[PDB]
Amino acid sequence: TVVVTTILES
Amino acid sequence: RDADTKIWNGMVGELVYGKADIAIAPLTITLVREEVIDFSKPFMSLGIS
Amino acid sequence: RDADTKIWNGMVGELVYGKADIAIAPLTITLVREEVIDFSKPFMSLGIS
Numbered sequence: 001t002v003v004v005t006t007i008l009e010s
Numbered sequence: 011r012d013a014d015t016k017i018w019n020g021m022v023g024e025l026v027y028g029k030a031d032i033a034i035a036p037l038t039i040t041l042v043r044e045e046v047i048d049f050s051k052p053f054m055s056l057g058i059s
Numbered sequence: 060r061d062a063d064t065k066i067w068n069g070m071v072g073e074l075v076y077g078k079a080d081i082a083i084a085p086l087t088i089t090l091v092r093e094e095v096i097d098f099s100k101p102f103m104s105l106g107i108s
Protein backbone atom coordinates (compact mmCIF):
# COMPACT_ATOMS: atom_id res chain seq x y z
CA THR A 1 0.00 0.00 0.00
CA VAL A 2 1.70 3.14 -1.34
CA VAL A 3 0.19 6.64 -1.47
CA VAL A 4 0.54 8.05 -4.99
CA THR A 5 -0.22 11.77 -4.84
CA THR A 6 -1.19 13.37 -8.14
CA ILE A 7 -3.06 16.32 -9.65
CA LEU A 8 -6.02 16.43 -12.04
CA GLU A 9 -4.55 17.87 -15.24
CA SER A 10 -5.72 16.57 -18.59
CA ARG B 11 8.29 26.91 -1.37
CA ASP B 12 6.64 29.78 0.49
CA ALA B 13 8.71 32.95 0.84
CA ASP B 14 7.20 34.17 4.13
CA THR B 15 6.98 30.92 6.09
CA LYS B 16 9.68 28.82 4.29
CA ILE B 17 7.34 25.83 3.96
CA TRP B 18 6.75 23.69 0.88
CA ASN B 19 3.15 23.59 -0.35
CA GLY B 20 1.65 21.37 -3.02
CA MET B 21 2.46 17.80 -4.02
CA VAL B 22 6.12 18.40 -3.10
CA GLY B 23 5.03 19.77 0.28
CA GLU B 24 2.93 16.65 0.77
CA LEU B 25 5.97 14.47 -0.06
CA VAL B 26 8.29 16.29 2.37
CA TYR B 27 5.73 16.10 5.17
CA GLY B 28 5.32 12.32 4.91
CA LYS B 29 1.64 12.23 3.93
CA ALA B 30 2.37 10.84 0.45
CA ASP B 31 4.84 8.08 -0.38
CA ILE B 32 5.41 8.91 -4.08
CA ALA B 33 4.27 11.43 -6.73
CA ILE B 34 3.62 9.83 -10.11
CA ALA B 35 2.35 13.12 -11.50
CA PRO B 36 3.14 15.70 -14.22
CA LEU B 37 5.71 17.53 -12.09
CA THR B 38 8.52 19.53 -13.68
CA ILE B 39 12.09 18.87 -12.53
CA THR B 40 13.75 22.01 -11.16
CA LEU B 41 16.71 22.87 -8.93
CA VAL B 42 14.81 23.91 -5.79
CA ARG B 43 12.64 20.78 -5.95
CA GLU B 44 15.73 18.57 -6.42
CA GLU B 45 17.24 20.04 -3.23
CA VAL B 46 14.34 18.91 -1.05
CA ILE B 47 13.11 15.73 -2.82
CA ASP B 48 14.66 13.20 -5.21
CA PHE B 49 13.46 12.70 -8.79
CA SER B 50 13.74 9.83 -11.21
CA LYS B 51 15.06 10.31 -14.71
CA PRO B 52 12.38 12.31 -16.57
CA PHE B 53 9.61 10.34 -18.27
CA MET B 54 8.39 13.07 -20.62
CA SER B 55 10.18 15.69 -22.72
CA LEU B 56 8.45 19.06 -22.95
CA GLY B 57 9.23 22.67 -23.75
CA ILE B 58 7.81 26.13 -24.31
CA SER B 59 6.07 26.22 -27.69
CA ARG C 60 28.99 -6.02 -21.17
CA ASP C 61 31.46 -8.50 -22.62
CA ALA C 62 30.35 -11.88 -24.00
CA ASP C 63 30.18 -14.10 -20.88
CA THR C 64 33.20 -12.63 -19.05
CA LYS C 65 30.86 -9.96 -17.57
CA ILE C 66 33.43 -7.16 -17.96
CA TRP C 67 32.46 -3.64 -18.96
CA ASN C 68 34.76 -2.29 -21.67
CA GLY C 69 35.21 1.31 -22.81
CA MET C 70 34.48 4.40 -20.74
CA VAL C 71 31.91 2.56 -18.61
CA GLY C 72 34.53 -0.01 -17.64
CA GLU C 73 36.95 2.75 -16.67
CA LEU C 74 34.25 4.07 -14.32
CA VAL C 75 33.42 0.66 -12.80
CA TYR C 76 36.97 -0.60 -12.24
CA GLY C 77 38.19 2.65 -10.67
CA LYS C 78 40.13 4.21 -13.56
CA ALA C 79 38.06 7.39 -13.95
CA ASP C 80 36.53 9.76 -11.41
CA ILE C 81 33.84 11.09 -13.80
CA ALA C 82 32.71 10.71 -17.43
CA ILE C 83 31.71 14.03 -18.97
CA ALA C 84 31.10 12.42 -22.33
CA PRO C 85 28.39 11.45 -24.85
CA LEU C 86 27.37 8.42 -22.78
CA THR C 87 23.80 7.22 -23.24
CA ILE C 88 21.69 6.71 -20.12
CA THR C 89 20.73 3.03 -20.43
CA LEU C 90 19.28 0.58 -17.89
CA VAL C 91 22.24 -1.83 -17.91
CA ARG C 92 24.61 1.10 -17.42
CA GLU C 93 22.35 2.55 -14.69
CA GLU C 94 22.65 -0.64 -12.63
CA VAL C 95 26.44 -0.41 -12.38
CA ILE C 96 27.15 3.36 -12.27
CA ASP C 97 25.44 6.70 -11.57
CA PHE C 98 23.97 9.11 -14.13
CA SER C 99 22.88 12.67 -13.62
CA LYS C 100 19.85 14.07 -15.43
CA PRO C 101 20.30 14.04 -19.24
CA PHE C 102 22.19 17.11 -20.39
CA MET C 103 21.08 16.56 -24.00
CA SER C 104 18.19 14.76 -25.72
CA LEU C 105 18.51 12.53 -28.77
CA GLY C 106 17.10 9.63 -30.73
CA ILE C 107 18.26 6.68 -32.78
CA SER C 108 18.15 7.87 -36.37
Ligand SMILES: NS(=O)(=O)c1cc2c(cc1Cl)N[C@H]([C@H]1C[C@H]3C=C[C@@H]1C3)NS2(=O)=O
Nearest residue numbers: 038039040052055056100101102103104105
Ligand atom coordinates in the same frame (compact mmCIF):
# COMPACT_ATOMS: atom_id res chain seq x y z
N1 LIG D 1 17.62 20.58 -26.79
S1 LIG D 1 18.74 19.68 -26.08
O1 LIG D 1 18.52 18.33 -26.49
O2 LIG D 1 20.00 20.29 -26.36
C1 LIG D 1 18.48 19.76 -24.34
C2 LIG D 1 17.93 18.66 -23.70
C3 LIG D 1 17.71 18.69 -22.33
C4 LIG D 1 18.02 19.81 -21.56
C5 LIG D 1 18.58 20.93 -22.22
C6 LIG D 1 18.79 20.89 -23.57
CL1 LIG D 1 19.47 22.31 -24.28
N2 LIG D 1 17.82 19.86 -20.21
C7 LIG D 1 17.01 18.86 -19.53
C8 LIG D 1 17.20 18.94 -18.01
C9 LIG D 1 16.20 19.87 -17.31
C10 LIG D 1 15.58 18.95 -16.23
C11 LIG D 1 14.82 17.89 -16.97
C12 LIG D 1 15.70 17.06 -17.49
C13 LIG D 1 17.07 17.61 -17.20
C14 LIG D 1 16.82 18.16 -15.79
N3 LIG D 1 17.38 17.52 -20.00
S2 LIG D 1 17.02 17.28 -21.56
O3 LIG D 1 15.60 17.32 -21.70
O4 LIG D 1 17.72 16.12 -22.00
